[PDB]
């Protein structure tokens, strides 16, 4: 299950930069970005293969891909953020 809905302005500012790269289809910094996300723990709502895709949210300073990601769905503004390496997810509200 999703752990709540969080305003985009309460997430790290790099999550807005990832949404803006999704909207222009890149270019992305990591070759994992844009691959299908299989939702293997079934934390997000169960959907067929190909509904979700994942993208890194940079962590400034980390020097690795780190723990933060956005996963997109296909419904309008259906974007989820995890900041703990896929253990939990929240729905992003991009209007606040």
């Amino acid at each position: 299950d999703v752990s709540g809905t969080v305003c985009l302005s309460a997430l790290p500012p790099e999550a807005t930069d990832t949404l803006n790269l999704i909207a222009s289809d890149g270019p992305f910094p990591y070759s994992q970005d844009g691959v299908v996300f299989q939702n293997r723990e079934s934390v997000l709502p169960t959907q067929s293969y190909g509904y979700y895709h994942e993208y890194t949210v940079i962590t400034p300073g980390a020097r690795t891909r780190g723990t933060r990601r956005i996963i997109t769905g296909e419904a309008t503004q259906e974007d989820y953020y995890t900041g703990d390496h896929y253990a939990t997810f929240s729905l992003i509200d991009q209007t606040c």
């Binding site: 994992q32 299989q38 939702n39 723990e41 390496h85 253990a87």
Partner: protein, 89 residues
């Protein structure tokens, strides 16, 4: 890199993830779940890797096929071209 899992000793999925975090030298922030393990096999682990999973059919029992889900992740990474050899006993 060689990783050994003694399958008769793992009775929780948590200890399976902790044993993977040690034997594959995953990041300290490893999320201990299947989507984090897939992210680490496609972006962090050293290769070639040899994974010896001894007494696999015992691990299947105790875990409900928490073990089979893990082993399916490794088989999918190998099918994408990561150089993994899986040896069960």
């Amino acid at each position: 890199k060689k990783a050994v899992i003694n399958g008769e000793q793992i009775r929780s999925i948590s200890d399976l993830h902790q044993t993977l975090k040690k034997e594959l030298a995953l990041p300290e922030y490893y999320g201990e779940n299947l989507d984090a393990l897939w992210d680490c096999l496609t972006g962090w682990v050293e290769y070639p890797l040899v994974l010896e999973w001894r007494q696999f059919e015992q691990s299947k029992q105790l875990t409900e096929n928490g073990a089979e889900s893990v082993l399916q992740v490794f088989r999918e990474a190998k099918a994408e071209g990561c150089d993994i050899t899986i040896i069960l006993s």
